[PDB]
Amino acid sequence: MQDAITAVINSADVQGKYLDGAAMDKLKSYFASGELRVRAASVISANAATIVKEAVAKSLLYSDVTRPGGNMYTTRRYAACIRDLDYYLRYATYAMLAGDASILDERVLNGLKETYNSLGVPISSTVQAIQAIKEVTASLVGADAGKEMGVYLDYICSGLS
């Protein structure tokens, strides 16, 4: 994985030069926008079960997915879906802290598509669940922090689709 600072360092390293002025400006932008990422990660780590619980109430409860025959029917499948949503929320928090979505490729999206297609997991239903996660965390954490969280959760949705 890499953050924004590590991405700038790696780009300047494979170019083979020192940090020029544009790299300094990108670093200054990240250093300016870091504190809001810190407080957003604090809020998400505070309420991390509540976004998952509320978003499952927003999208998946009392529906065909949790009804008999659905993919979230049994308790083991419900616990697996809650585990998957916890993974998505935690890794989106990691990507929001890093300012880069590289960890989502390295850890999450490298095999999730083929894993879900082997498992029979409804990718559309997971997309609606992650959009519900996005809406709940955007209501909870603020405006621009909610925008950043929505960007990384839409990256997770784009990796699933």
Partner 1 sequence: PSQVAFASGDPIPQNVARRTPGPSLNRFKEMARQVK
Partner 2 sequence: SIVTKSIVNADAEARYLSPGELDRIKAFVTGGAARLRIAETLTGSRETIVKQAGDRLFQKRPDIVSPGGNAYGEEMTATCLRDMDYYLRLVTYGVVSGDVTPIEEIGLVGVREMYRSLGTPIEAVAQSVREMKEVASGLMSSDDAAEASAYFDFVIGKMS
Partner 3 sequence: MRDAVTTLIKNYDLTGRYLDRNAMDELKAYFESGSARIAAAAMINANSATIVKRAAAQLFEEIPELIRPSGNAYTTRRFSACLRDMDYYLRYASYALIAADNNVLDERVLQGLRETYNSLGVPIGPTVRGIQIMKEMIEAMAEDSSLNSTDFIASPFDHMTRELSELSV
Ligand X SMILES: *[C@H](C)[C@H]1/C(=C/c2[nH]c(/C=C3N=C(/C=C4\NC(=O)C(CC)=C4C)C(C)=C\3CCC(=O)O)c(CCC(=O)O)c2C)NC(=O)[C@@H]1C
Residues tagged in the binding site annotation for (2R,3E)-phycocyanobilin:
81
Is there binding between residue 28 and a second copy (CB under 8 A)? no
- 45 touches, from partner 3, ligand X, partner 2, none (C-beta below 5 to 8 Å by class): partner 2
What are the angstrom distances between the C-alpha of 36 and each of 42, 89, 95, 144, 154? Answer: 10, 17, 14, 9, 20
Could you tell me where the DSSP H helices lie in 16-143? 21-32, 34-46, 48-59, 75-98, 102-103, 112-119, 123-141
State the amino acid at position 137 in one-letter form: T
How buried is residue 92: exposed, middle or buried, by Cβ count under 10 Å (0-12/13-18/19+)? buried
- Distance (Å, whole) CA 8 – CA 21: 12
Task: List all residues 6 or more positions away from 108 whose beta carbon is below 8 Å from its beta carbon.
Answer: 87, 88, 91, 156, 159
Site map (CB under 6 A) of ligand X, residues 11-50, x = contact: ----------------------------------------
Q: What is the DSSP letter of 27?
A: H
Q: What are the structure tokens assigned to 13, written together?
A: 């390293």
**Contact with a second copy (CB under 8 A) among 18, 32, 69, 76:** 69
User: Considering only residues 5, 6, 9, 11, which one is a binding residue for a second copy as defined by CB under 8 A?
Assistant: 11
- The partner in contact with residue 44, picked from partner 3, partner 2, a second copy, none with C-beta cut-offs of 5 to 8 angstroms by kind, is partner 2
Which residues would be at the binding site for a second copy (CB under 8 A)? 7, 10-11, 13-16, 63-65, 67-71, 73, 100-102, 105, 109-110, 113-114, 117-118, 120-125, 127-128, 151-152, 154-155, 157-161
Which residues would be at the binding site for ligand X (CB under 6 A)? 57, 60-62, 65-66, 71-78, 80-81, 84-85, 87, 91, 107-108, 112, 115, 119, 121-122, 125-126, 129
